Design an enzyme around this catalytic site. Structure first.
Site, PDB file in Angstrom:
ATOM      1  N   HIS A 263      72.349  51.233 -41.432  1.00  0.00           N
ATOM      2  CA  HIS A 263      71.135  51.579 -42.179  1.00  0.00           C
ATOM      3  C   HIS A 263      71.333  51.495 -43.699  1.00  0.00           C
ATOM      4  O   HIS A 263      70.387  51.675 -44.454  1.00  0.00           O
ATOM      5  CB  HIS A 263      70.569  52.953 -41.754  1.00  0.00           C
ATOM      6  CG  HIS A 263      71.399  54.161 -42.112  1.00  0.00           C
ATOM      7  ND1 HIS A 263      71.575  54.599 -43.406  1.00  0.00           N
ATOM      8  CD2 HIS A 263      71.988  55.090 -41.319  1.00  0.00           C
ATOM      9  CE1 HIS A 263      72.301  55.708 -43.401  1.00  0.00           C
ATOM     10  NE2 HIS A 263      72.562  56.028 -42.147  1.00  0.00           N
TER      11      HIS A 263
ATOM     12  N   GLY B 280      74.058  61.258 -48.584  1.00  0.00           N
ATOM     13  CA  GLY B 280      75.163  60.525 -49.163  1.00  0.00           C
ATOM     14  C   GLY B 280      76.422  60.692 -48.339  1.00  0.00           C
ATOM     15  O   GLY B 280      77.441  60.063 -48.623  1.00  0.00           O
TER      16      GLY B 280
ATOM     17  N   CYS C  13      76.557  60.049 -45.108  1.00  0.00           N
ATOM     18  CA  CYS C  13      76.587  59.010 -44.080  1.00  0.00           C
ATOM     19  C   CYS C  13      77.809  58.123 -44.274  1.00  0.00           C
ATOM     20  O   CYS C  13      78.161  57.775 -45.408  1.00  0.00           O
ATOM     21  CB  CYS C  13      75.312  58.180 -44.103  1.00  0.00           C
ATOM     22  SG  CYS C  13      73.871  59.109 -43.550  1.00  0.00           S
TER      23      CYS C  13
HETATM   24  C1  LIG Z   1      66.752  54.200 -48.400  1.00  0.00           C
HETATM   25  C2  LIG Z   1      66.861  55.421 -47.484  1.00  0.00           C
HETATM   26  O1  LIG Z   1      66.286  56.447 -47.804  1.00  0.00           O
HETATM   27  N1  LIG Z   1      67.647  55.320 -46.285  1.00  0.00           N
HETATM   28  C3  LIG Z   1      67.843  56.348 -45.285  1.00  0.00           C
HETATM   29  C4  LIG Z   1      66.975  57.447 -45.168  1.00  0.00           C
HETATM   30  C5  LIG Z   1      67.178  58.411 -44.173  1.00  0.00           C
HETATM   31  C6  LIG Z   1      68.237  58.285 -43.278  1.00  0.00           C
HETATM   32  N2  LIG Z   1      68.395  59.293 -42.248  1.00  0.00           N
HETATM   33  C7  LIG Z   1      69.285  60.407 -42.414  1.00  0.00           C
HETATM   34  O2  LIG Z   1      69.382  61.238 -41.536  1.00  0.00           O
HETATM   35  C8  LIG Z   1      70.109  60.534 -43.685  1.00  0.00           C
HETATM   36  N3  LIG Z   1      70.989  61.687 -43.613  1.00  0.00           N
HETATM   37  N4  LIG Z   1      72.200  61.711 -43.049  1.00  0.00           N
HETATM   38  N5  LIG Z   1      72.720  62.952 -43.182  1.00  0.00           N
HETATM   39  C9  LIG Z   1      71.807  63.757 -43.854  1.00  0.00           C
HETATM   40  C10 LIG Z   1      71.810  65.120 -44.262  1.00  0.00           C
HETATM   41  C11 LIG Z   1      70.713  65.649 -44.938  1.00  0.00           C
HETATM   42  C12 LIG Z   1      69.596  64.839 -45.219  1.00  0.00           C
HETATM   43  C13 LIG Z   1      69.586  63.499 -44.816  1.00  0.00           C
HETATM   44  C14 LIG Z   1      70.699  62.959 -44.129  1.00  0.00           C
HETATM   45  C15 LIG Z   1      67.593  59.143 -41.023  1.00  0.00           C
HETATM   46  C16 LIG Z   1      66.391  60.098 -40.903  1.00  0.00           C
HETATM   47  O3  LIG Z   1      65.814  60.193 -39.826  1.00  0.00           O
HETATM   48  N6  LIG Z   1      66.005  60.871 -42.083  1.00  0.00           N
HETATM   49  C17 LIG Z   1      64.934  61.847 -42.223  1.00  0.00           C
HETATM   50  C18 LIG Z   1      64.620  62.001 -43.679  1.00  0.00           C
HETATM   51  C19 LIG Z   1      63.656  61.459 -41.509  1.00  0.00           C
HETATM   52  C20 LIG Z   1      65.417  63.181 -41.717  1.00  0.00           C
HETATM   53  C21 LIG Z   1      67.344  57.660 -40.756  1.00  0.00           C
HETATM   54  C22 LIG Z   1      68.366  56.718 -40.123  1.00  0.00           C
HETATM   55  C23 LIG Z   1      67.816  55.389 -40.054  1.00  0.00           C
HETATM   56  S1  LIG Z   1      66.333  55.369 -40.680  1.00  0.00           S
HETATM   57  C24 LIG Z   1      66.167  56.921 -41.105  1.00  0.00           C
HETATM   58  C25 LIG Z   1      69.093  57.187 -43.371  1.00  0.00           C
HETATM   59  C26 LIG Z   1      68.885  56.219 -44.378  1.00  0.00           C
END
Ligand SMILES: CC(=O)Nc1ccc(N(C(=O)Cn2nnc3ccccc32)[C@@H](C(=O)NC(C)(C)C)c2ccsc2)cc1
Ligand SMILES: CC(=O)Nc1ccc(N(C(=O)Cn2nnc3ccccc32)[C@@H](C(=O)NC(C)(C)C)c2ccsc2)cc1
Lengths: 306, 306
Positions: A41, A146, A148
């Site tokens: 991602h 961040g 990830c």
């Molecule tokens: C450009 C950009 O913004 N890229 C991005 C955005 C979000 C994620 N996600 C995380 O969980 C990121 N992440 N990973 N660990 C986290 C801890 C706290 C907050 C966020 C966190 C997923 C998700 O579902 N996120 C929501 C906000 C809906 C909860 C996801 C995976 C593929 S698409 C979306 C990954 C990449």
């Protein structure tokens, strides 16, 4: 004596953490040999998050789309010479092998299993903690976006066993990731969609191990003559969000050492589940199910029953 | 999101662990530059553990009495060329400087502070965990027989801050050690002779930080309009085994980002001290007091509520 959440020493893994940047996205990667691993991602722009076409994204990037840097120890800027997908992982081939590559294997852990997590931010290790793969194949960790690319692993005989790369946070305090074959733990997709978790369950055998740990540490008020047959317990477990119990050698040895039977421990679980009667076990008033029998064995080695 | 017990990454410290043997006794040591530190009770035979004359022991030892080996990484047999006493520590000088010595400092932590521990055995790092210096200056850790000399530390900007060398177990899950000035935490003595522990207390300021962390993670059922002034809570504390509250900037910052006042948290404490009434906070049914306000700040860096 004592029982605490203990992790495997993180040094060998710290030597492998790098920062990966693609467009305005950045996260952590794992550099072993001439390969850098990170969540796929990283390629997806924020406006496609809800329905990414990862195949399209992959070949819309050039190798020089990816900036890979090591910030700690022997610093370096690494040239990407190939990129492909491995399930929900991006596999970057770079033109220099990590001279600090530990002896390592890849594994996929089962629900109930513990592993250590090196949390990373921007290619820099920041903390270490231990988690357990939950019944619904999630984990209860501590991450930011961040974070990830943060890495889960175990260690035995100087061999690092890499088992998890952090991918996303599903709900509050609830996370998932993939093994390094790129298979996501659980029924989860790396998309921005509402996904429902299967209901979680207490891991019975881990609770039993924890109760043995308690007894070896002088805490034994919960042990009664009462016993419950395994078959009876398992029926009850179905309706009370506990996993079925299946005995193991290590549990038997903890039984032998304490003189407390497995059936007594399962009875204690049924009583304790209804309530702790205003008392504590090893400092807690809830059942602890993230210690495996093996984790317990390490921390009660040579401990003699009193 | 999520709140777990996190430790500082251990790699920099792993590079400094060695094994120290004196006669029949063996344990772990810390190798920095040309110095190796280890507990002085390595000099004592199983017999006179009751009332050791360390000054006499010291002069009966020659430099050749001490065998120092590095068993991990770049292995090494180190020649001891001087030895002297530093409180309850032995300071050995060796003929080779540790090539992998990190930038470091020494300090002595105060009750209520957290630090990371690298548990070691026969000179081999085996595990990482976090502890908190209790009101009576003990720690609740996990240490086995040959774990003496295990090292506690914090990280301060590429600098390892060494704060603890493990010395002994006082009782089940209860341990102490010395800072590297050789002063024992809690002033307990490195003798057999069973010593009385001062009564422990809940660290109020840490409980408060934990409640903030709970609120920052969507758990807020305990918060009431009820307040109780600091002056008043402190009087109550003296009679209920809590430390007195003293405000700090980190606490203010947390009250600030939560909109929940310190006085509201102190109120919750008195109530929650009575019972959790079946409910839980961050999955626990007891008050957690081993997270400092700084610990919490770190795991809530970049987090906004609901
Ligand atoms: C450009 C950009 O913004 N890229 C991005 C955005 C979000 C994620 N996600 C995380 O969980 C990121 N992440 N990973 N660990 C986290 C801890 C706290 C907050 C966020 C966190 C997923 C998700 O579902 N996120 C929501 C906000 C809906 C909860 C996801 C995976 C593929 S698409 C979306 C990954 C990449
Ligand atoms: C040759 C030999 O016997 N060496 C030896 C043995 C034990 C210790 N002790 C530890 O706590 C070692 N230690 N440190 N952490 C431990 C956890 C579990 C078991 C032992 C542990 C102290 C102690 O409590 N000892 C009794 C005998 C009471 C058990 C101590 C400290 C100064 S003098 C004696 C120190 C040296």
């Amino acid at each position: 004596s004592g029982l605490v959440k203990m992790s495997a020493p993180s040094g060998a893994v710290e030597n492998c953490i790098v920062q990966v940047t693609c467009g305005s996205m950045t996260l952590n990667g794992l550099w072993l040999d001439n390969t850098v691993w990170c969540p796929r991602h990283i390629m997806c722009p924020a406006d496609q998050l809800t329905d990414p076409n990862y195949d399209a994204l992959l070949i819309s990037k050039t190798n020089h789309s990816f900036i890979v840097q090591k910030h700690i120890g022997a610093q370096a800027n690494l040239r990407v010479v190939a990129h492909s997908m491995v399930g929900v992982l991006l596999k970057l081939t770079v033109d220099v092998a990590n001279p600090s590559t530990p002896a390592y294997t890849f594994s996929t852990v089962k629900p109930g299993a513990s592993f250590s997590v090196l949390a990373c931010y921007n290619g820099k290790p920041t903390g270490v903690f231990t988690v357990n793969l939950r019944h619904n194949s999630t984990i209860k960790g501590s991450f930011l976006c961040g974070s990830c690319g943060s890495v889960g692993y175990t260690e035995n005989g100087g061999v690092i066993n890499f088992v998890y790369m952090h991918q996303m946070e599903l709900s509050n305090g609830t996370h998932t990731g993939s093994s390094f074959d790129g298979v996501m733990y659980g029924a989860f997709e790396d998309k921005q969609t509402h996904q429902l978790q299967l209901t979680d369950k207490y891991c019975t055998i881990n609770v039993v191990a924890w109760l043995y740990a308690a007894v070896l540490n002088g805490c034994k008020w919960f042990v009664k003559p009462t016993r419950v047959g395994i078959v009876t317990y398992n029926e009850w477990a179905l309706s009370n969000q506990f996993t079925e119990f299946v005995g193991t050698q290590s549990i038997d040895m903890l039984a032998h050492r304490t003189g407390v039977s497995v059936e007594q421990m399962l009875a204690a679980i049924q009583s304790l589940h209804a309530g702790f009667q205003g008392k504590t076990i090893l400092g807690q008033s809830t059942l602890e199910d993230e210690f495996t029998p093996d984790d317990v064995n390490m921390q009660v080695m040579g401990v003699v029953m009193q």
